[PDB]
Amino acid sequence: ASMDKVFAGYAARQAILESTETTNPFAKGIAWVEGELVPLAEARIPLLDQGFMRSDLTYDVPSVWDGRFFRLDDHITRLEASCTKLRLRLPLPRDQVKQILVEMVAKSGIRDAHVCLIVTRGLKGVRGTRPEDIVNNLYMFVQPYVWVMEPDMQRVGGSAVVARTVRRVPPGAIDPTVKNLQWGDLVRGMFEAADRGATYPFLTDGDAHLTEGSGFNIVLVKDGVLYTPDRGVLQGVTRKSVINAAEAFGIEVRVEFVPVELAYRCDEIFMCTTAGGIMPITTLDGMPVNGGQIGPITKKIWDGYWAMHYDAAYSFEIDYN
Amino acid sequence: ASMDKVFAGYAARQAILESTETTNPFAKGIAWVEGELVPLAEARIPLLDQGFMRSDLTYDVPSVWDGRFFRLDDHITRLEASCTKLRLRLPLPRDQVKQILVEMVAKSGIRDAHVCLIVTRGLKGVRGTRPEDIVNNLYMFVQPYVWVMEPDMQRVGGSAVVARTVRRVPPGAIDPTVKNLQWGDLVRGMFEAADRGATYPFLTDGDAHLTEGSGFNIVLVKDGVLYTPDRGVLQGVTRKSVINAAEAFGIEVRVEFVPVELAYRCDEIFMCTTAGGIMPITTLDGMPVNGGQIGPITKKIWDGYWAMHYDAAYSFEIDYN
């Protein structure tokens, strides 16, 4: 139903944005460093920031679609929860943060965007420093919307592998409910998928069950029911939205341990993430997924997810003036 | 034997270094960014460097002691091996890198230094980018020598706990032989140690065997034999030096699986790392280690390690001009 209109609207807005790149220095993105706004490519951070020297940070990425922020409060709440888990504190009041983000989006002119917030430990690390001398740092940026699966590929589905050379970092080492930039396993998964002639890695928990991939959650569909891992993964806002849509449609969702074998016996597969939305998978380990076409439940969820971007309960319009 | 002389020499050189800070802007450290040398506190990197945005990097840290580089070639070789494991290439030829590092140390005037080299994926990530479009980035810096255990604590020994709230990232998720800045588990360990009234965390593999801690390897001594984990840890150059010293002294070193129980029954414990050297642990989980005094084999290894800093087989003198 909705792919043609959603993608044609994006293409039209994107053509306007691209036409402005020689006159609007923020059309390729804008960043906030130390209270100053700069073109994204020009943004620089201290080499000794502990977000670099120990990846001692969390981040979150709400999005803007067609000039409407999508579930912004959910993302800021998750960022605050991640900060609490790491003993960080968002460095400005949350209402001020939201005001800055809206200002940045409006100044950029970007209708479709990813809006990244990063909170780091600061210039002084946990080791040795008296806890009262720790001052956490905040970096924020707006960039043109990033696609983990491009629109043309979403029309046919992508190719995934269950990774065999790497598995997901377990929660008792690094908590995956804290969105983080320690991607060592996820980068290994991306290289493995490419080495195997595929694009997307699905990582196991190291114990014969599925977790997530390189920046996305995994959903399996079998006999009219959605299955998605509970433990070992980020609790995605896209996944939350999939659950809202499934509930509205009367489709059961099981958020539980998902055995690896189910990926080989299921009727449909899709990935979900803010950077791309609902991303069908139609080849797994080199084999068609149940015939190789995008499935009917995936299509219903796809349309429902994008409709939520216009529902006032999940989105709001930004004033670009 | 050697602690007084080693630490008095360092204290004397530190007083000289501090006296140069008002006339040498590099005396507090110097960094190399994009071929330019800048005072360390002023060094900045692009916000979108994938070393920041995905911790997609490796690093290595040779040191200078009393104006002598210690095992520099071993560290550059390990950096190149880590780069190979991550599909990264050191940006400059290794002989040019060494010449730059010596130049930077000389300009700083620092005689006791840590010298950090970082190789990142660059401005374009693994995902999506044509492999030929990837250009890796190099950052280097010299800083005054950093102590994981300060000199006066090395005199009496430190307190450790076997961590119970976190375990080490396993090798099939992130390879710990690649020195890396993805410290999520190690930072959790440091907070746990502090919460439990100790200074250092020892992390298990979760499977009842010891690995390493927050920036150091772990050595247990029992009945005249040293034991240190093989799998799950960085193959430290300090640990290598401990092995060289032990072999010279006729002390057996077993690099093998070390059950957690051995830490509670052993005669001595020490940590080892380039940022501090040989670091005795005299309480574990609140209990004195075999009486709570620094042990005789620890002291022999301590003295042997520092002697190797003046042996031409392991070191060379920098010309500071």
> In the beta sheet, which residues pair with residue A216?
A213
Say what the alpha-carbon torsion angle A51, A54, A60, A66 is, to the nearest 10 degrees.
60
Q: Select from A33, A58, A37 the least CA-distant residue to B44.
A: A33
Helix (H) or strand (E) holding B303: helix B296-307
Q: Is B54 on the interface with A (CB under 8 A)?
A: yes
Q: Is the CA virtual torsion B227, B231, B237, B238 positive or negative?
A: negative
A255 Cα distance to chain centroid: 19
Number of H helices, E strands in chain B: 9, 18
Continuous H helices in A109-225: 151-154, 184-195
Question: Per residue in B179-193, is it b (16+ CB within 10 Å) or e — as a string?
Answer: bbbbbbbbbbbbbbb
Task: Give the CA count within 13 Å in the CB-facing half-sphere of B160.
Answer: 30
| Distance, CA of B195 to CA of B192 (rounded, Å) | 5
Contacts of A233 (CB under 8 A, 6+ apart): A168, A176, A177, A211, A212, A217
Give CA–CA dist A205/A216, Å, rounded. 15
Task: Return the residues preceding each gap in chain A, C–N over 2.5 A, or none.
Answer: none
Q: Are A62 and A75 in contact (CB under 8 A)?
A: yes
CB contact under 8 A, B206 and A52: no
Neighbours of B300 (CB within 10 A): 16
For this entry, resolution in Å reads: 1.3
Q: Closest Cα partner for B167 from B204, B209, B195?
A: B204
Shortest CA gap A123–chain B (Å): 10
- How far does the CA of residue A206 sit from the closest CA of chain B (Å)? 8
| Domains in chain A: ranges and CATH | 2-144 (3.30.470.10), 151-309 (3.20.10.10)
User: B205 to chain A: nearest residue by CA?
Assistant: A173
What determination technique applies here? Answer: X-ray
Q: List the beta bridge partners of residue B228.
A: B255
The helix/strand/coil state of B213 is: strand
Q: Which two tokens stand for residue B171?
A: 């090798």
CA distance A103 to A92: 15
Cα–Cα nearest to B149, from B137, B138, B159, B136: B159
Task: Give the integer Cα–Cα distance in Å for B309 and B65.
Answer: 7
Structure tokens at A146: 């990033």
Q: Which helix (H) or strand (E) holds A203?
A: strand A200-204
- Of B43, B166, B170, which has the smallest distance from its Cβ to A206's Cβ? B170
Nearest chain B CA: its distance from A247 CA (Å): 33
